[PDB]
Ligand binder design. Structure first.
Ligand code: PLP
Ligand code: PLP
Ligand code: CL
Ligand code: CL
Lengths: 443, 443
């Protein structure tokens, strides 16, 4: 009660309705986490159905991660990486990331989050073309329904228009093309080609894509989509940036999302699950040719970086986090439990009247709600079906998040990679019960 | 030796010359820190003369900060603050920050760093005017020689042109006016007025200033400067944003830098010393009227925020960090040891031939080098005097940083707030010996 009033007075939340906060107070005040579970201050326990924010990949309560952070903080919590200063944790983490990326992605620039990483990637690809002598190759192409963060550049690279309306556009040379959502590869790829030709490939620096569009509703591309993308980018001399902020570190049943489509990007950004959210960290990995151009032509000080780039404690936590993912076979577990969740939720679809698509790639998936799945009739937006299911799930002990941009009704699912079959079974049953409740309240 | 080669191959550093890295390897590889000291992998020990990056304010090796992080990471390392979800650490930290800011600055938006904070502040002031019905009040005014970070907006708000040349300008509605460096208050304030009138106050959202320009060379404004600034901002209906990223949390001998000038900003950003760099954290504090406008007119979800906004572990570390600053009287110690360092370095000035200005406000200060201090003749830039002093300091066991933008030669000084008088004495003597060595090599 005191915590609720203090929150209202003093804490302006990210991605929260301030008017809701003032009227109702915090929806929930979390206190403790353990494995896939979170407990609030009233003692009620929940399954953390999207891993908090698609990031607590190894689960809550990891004594080993706490110990790895405490050991480095006693030893040397922070040291500068500026002016070529370095330290062993960042070096070892960079070497480790290079050992687990796609072939040729061996050089890492560190940050503290996903927005920082994507803003850095925009600046790095523009820097790359400028030192190449092509200062006109400047524009960033990205997808509708994409989400790339909300620092000033990534706010406009983000393809969901709600994010532009908070402050307006601050960036300039950005272009949004059609997504593969409910589209063929040829349609999506031709939209990219048409925009490239309207703009002229000599003005374009890079194409950014999430392997699986996360905030857009877990949009999983056709099997040939990124093969084409990679061929188009090659043909026009455009850099392909893969945004692995959600899909990285085992989330889709591969170490990185893009491996599902057998394509190597020029650049990759990451954050979130690299530390299972225990410590803010992100970064940008670049290909060998790009690193070589940097070495040859990036003269003097590289005028970009963050105080906390390469933070030794972040790096110590990330190293232990990656070792856990390897030792517990969490990449493989993510693929098998994603299959198990998809199989179960398909059965649930057949028990209900209002479930449309059910899709997963590893432990990254989604359940669409529709007035008539067989004809693909959606609910009108004013019924707010997916948010109602979120609320019913919440009351039944499951935290999920919904996506309704542009008249969709999508329940997102992405539990921690440690989840087991017993737990998948209960999660599926609760999802059934919550959709059934809303299905019933709708007459 | 293996660490040096791995660093070259895999780690692209912030604000480092990649070509230097490839040719010479990391200048230093740090291993351990304790209090004001750092030790590298060869066993050589250094005084951390700028607190690593103006941020390790309570010193290295704090077992209490390690323990505070480990306790929260075992309990609940991360939980979302989106959708009005909350948790006790962020609530308590927000309440704590509100207890120590200038009067009326009671509501906090959290981030993970200084660039994130300033990009958020740009977006928040633009949001504020848009919901006020003035979508044209958009432009951000800032100072030459300022540094506000290098996310996409803060890259252009930053007033030092080197930062623009890495990727070019990405932002649009920015304006740079003359700094108070070697200037009168009336000159600096009239430059601000002239630009406001050329642009028209109806197009201007905000004026950003560091209380003390840090990366610009520790530029300390005249005593009346911010009084005038605050009157000009009031007169034109412009928001005054104080960038406390360096000057916050005791650095200048006050809790916040702006208190030295008896002025309350509309908005304040912070990072760095809030956790003494033990855990990435930053934020934006807004005045009561602004919070009230948000409450009344910021409809629906606030479409801004970072995954790690309000990170529970960051907040637990920051709380203990602030309690240390209070219990060890570090704000007062910073003022007294700044006075002691200024007094000592003035004596050193009189023993040497090439020291110009010596200035401090608390433990934030600078020592200028000049060919002829009495007539104010500078060294030509091609002599690189200040960087040579940096190197000589380094070899004598002191890490400082230099500022040479626009033909200056400035040694920056900002040791952790725990430094004691014995330590100030040794630091002063080493500074004397290093400037004397370069003074001598220059014939
Ligand atoms: C795909 C993607 N990229 C970037 C971001 C931004 O990351 P952060 O919130 O750490 O700045 C997000 C956050 O959800 C994301 O989902
Ligand atoms: C005054 C000021 N503002 C902002 C920043 C950027 O902070 P960060 O490096 O955490 O993004 C800096 C960093 O030195 C700074 O000195
Ligand atoms: Cl392990
Ligand atoms: Cl204490």
């Amino acid at each position: 009660r005191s915590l609720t009033e203090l929150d209202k007075k003093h804490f302006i939340h990210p991605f929260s309705s301030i008017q809701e906060q003032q009227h109702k107070g915090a929806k929930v005040i979390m206190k403790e986490g353990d494995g896939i579970y979170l407990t609030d201050v009233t003692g009620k326990t929940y399954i953390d159905g999207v891993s908090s924010l698609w990031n607590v990949n190894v689960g809550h309560g990891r004594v080993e991660l706490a110990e790895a952070a405490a050991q480095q903080m006693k030893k040397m919590a922070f040291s500068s990486a500026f002016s070529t200063f370095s330290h062993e944790p960042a070096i070892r983490l960079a070497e480790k990331i290079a050992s687990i990326t796609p072939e040729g992605l061996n050089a890492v620039f560190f940050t503290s989050g996903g927005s920082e990483s994507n803003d850095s990637a925009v600046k790095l690809v523009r820097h790359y073309w400028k030192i190449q002598g092509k200062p006109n190759k400047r524009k960033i192409i990205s997808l509708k329904r994409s989400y790339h963060g909300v620092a000033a550049a990534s706010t406009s690279v983000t393809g969901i228009p709600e994010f532009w309306g908070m402050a307006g556009h601050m960036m300039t040379d950005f272009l949004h093309v059609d997504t593969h959502y409910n589209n063929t590869t040829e349609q999506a790829v031709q939209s990219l080609c048409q925009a490239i030709e309207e703009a002229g490939p000599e003005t374009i620096a890079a194409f950014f894509a999430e392997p699986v569009q996360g905030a857009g509703g877990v949009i999983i591309p056709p099997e040939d989509y990124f093969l084409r993308i990679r061929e188009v980018c090659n043909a026009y001399g455009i850099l392909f940036v893969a945004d692995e902020v959600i899909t990285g570190f085992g989330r889709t049943g591969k170490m990185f999302g893009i491996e599902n489509w057998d394509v190597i990007p020029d650049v990759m950004t990451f954050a979130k699950g690299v530390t299972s959210g225990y410590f803010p960290l992100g970064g940008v990995v670049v290909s060998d040719p790009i690193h070589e151009v940097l070495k040859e032509k990036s003269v003097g000080t590289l005028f970009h970086g963050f105080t906390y780039s390469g933070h030794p404690t972040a790096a110590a936590v990330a190293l232990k986090n990656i070792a856990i993912i390897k030792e517990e076979r969490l990449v493989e577990n993510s693929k098998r439990m994603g299959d198990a969740l998809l199989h179960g939720l398909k059965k649930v679809k057949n028990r209900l009247e209002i479930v449309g698509d059910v899709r997963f790639v590893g432990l990254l998936g989604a359940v669409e709600l529709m007035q008539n799945p067989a004809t693909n009739k959606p609910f009108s937006s004013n019924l707010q079906v997916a948010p109602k299911v979120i609320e019913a799930l919440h009351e039944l002990g499951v935290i999920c998040r919904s996506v309704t941009y542009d008249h969709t009704n999508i329940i997102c699912l992405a539990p921690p990679l440690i989840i087991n079959q017993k737990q998948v079974d209960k999660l599926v049953e609760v999802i059934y019960e919550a959709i059934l409740k809303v299905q019933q309240q709708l007459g």
